[PDB]
């Protein structure tokens, strides 16, 4: 006669025989902040390690911060053997992964790249990447998930983003497909990518209503729909009703 289930954010619903529905709310705020404010690429290894360590120390994760600093010293340096710490780095990655902290393991894998990629097998790396991506998507952190996918050291995880994400656009006047890298119609010889607001060629981002088949610059359409409910091109369509 009882029901029980945690939610994502630590809240817990518990319905039992009197039946009374109670949500025992609290958790993972550290995970959200950590995922949001690491930098995984675009800077040298030392800078990335110091930034991540500063994040971990600010959030109160002293062990994570010292791990980042230790990685910086180990990698970004009558000397120690070149592969002296590889076993220890692998053990640290496995230690963080086996306790549910897949975020730290994936971040270290991405930051280090090939320095540790060849030492961890592909299957475990893919498992960590997928677990971290699922955690990020649960918290609705799409930007961090896509950054991880783009910077993923595994080819299979990288290919997860290129599946059915290409749009085939056609000219309305000619009803024929357009070139894959174009902004002018092949047949009609008309700038079919004209913004409905500014009447300028939309070379980059194009937002398109599915009702009236009209659109334009993403910012321009956003502003117009913020200021009105009609189609900017003027087809009597309430594209975003109310």
């Amino acid at each position: 006669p009882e029901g029980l289930c945690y939610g994502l954010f630590g809240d817990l619903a518990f319905a039992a025989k009197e039946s009374a529905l109670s949500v025992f709310e609290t958790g993972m705020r550290w995970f959200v902040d950590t995922a949001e404010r690491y930098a995984l690429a675009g800077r040298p290894l030392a800078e990335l390690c110091d930034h991540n360590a500063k994040v971990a120390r600010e959030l109160g994760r002293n062990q994570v911060a010292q791990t980042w600093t230790m990685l910086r010293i180990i990698y970004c340096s009558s000397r120690l053997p070149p592969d002296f710490f590889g076993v220890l780095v692998r053990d640290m990655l496995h230690f963080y992964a086996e306790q549910g902290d897949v975020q730290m393991a994936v971040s270290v894998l991405i930051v280090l790249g090939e320095r540790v990629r060849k030492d961890i097998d592909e299957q475990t790396q893919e498992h960590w990447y997928t677990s971290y991506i699922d955690l990020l998507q649960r918290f609705r952190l799409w930007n961090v998930s896509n950054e991880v996918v783009k910077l993923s050291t595994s080819r299979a995880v990288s290919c997860l983003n290129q599946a059915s994400t290409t749009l085939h656009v056609n000219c309305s006047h000619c009803k024929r497909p357009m070139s894959s890298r174009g902004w002018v119609c092949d047949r009609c010889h008309r700038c079919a990518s004209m913004c409905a607001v500014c009447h300028h060629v939309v070379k980059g981002l194009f937002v398109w209503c599915q009702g009236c088949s009209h659109g334009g610059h993403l910012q321009h359409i956003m502003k117009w729909l913020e200021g009105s409910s009609h189609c900017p091109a003027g087809c009597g369509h309430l594209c975003e009703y109310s």
Partner: protein
Amino acid sequence: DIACLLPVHKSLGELYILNVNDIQETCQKNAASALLVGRKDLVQVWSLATVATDLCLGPKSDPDLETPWARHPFGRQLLESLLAHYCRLRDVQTLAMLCSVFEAQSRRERERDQHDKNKRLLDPANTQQFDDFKKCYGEILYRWGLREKRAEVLKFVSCPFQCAICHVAVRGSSNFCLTCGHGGHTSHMMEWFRTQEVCPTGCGCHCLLESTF
């Protein structure tokens, strides 16, 4: 002279310091001294010790609060790997230095005892080896002539009257003449006998001649 053949350095022994109160400062100075001598591996190891001996990584009494840094692969496993490498190199200097730096940080019931045994970056089941490391390095330092350094290192081993001048009670360091028996505070006799030669109480004993045998 074959000081280059040995894994230990006399200059490093002169330059190393061991302050129990501050570990990060000692690690930083040791890394600087290693760079001055020219040991890149020692610089890396000392920086690793600087990071891994931070006071904010102190284990909690309750085992349920967090995983101790010793259980972290960058803790006990790191230290064991470094100790194994310098045991292969037979570097008594670095071994004793690490076993002192990581020991100064260390300064239901069965689970609590096991957690206490598991929260130390130095393995409790191998304290005899660490004490042997420290004793051998102390003997090496004494052989060099750095008695102060040897005494400083040996402090990390786990297993071990009124003044005739100021007329104040003497409880700390004191010098008492064997011939006559009058003394007091050490600094008082240090100042007094640098000029005079008889006992400061007027007994007439030539304490410097009859005590400094």
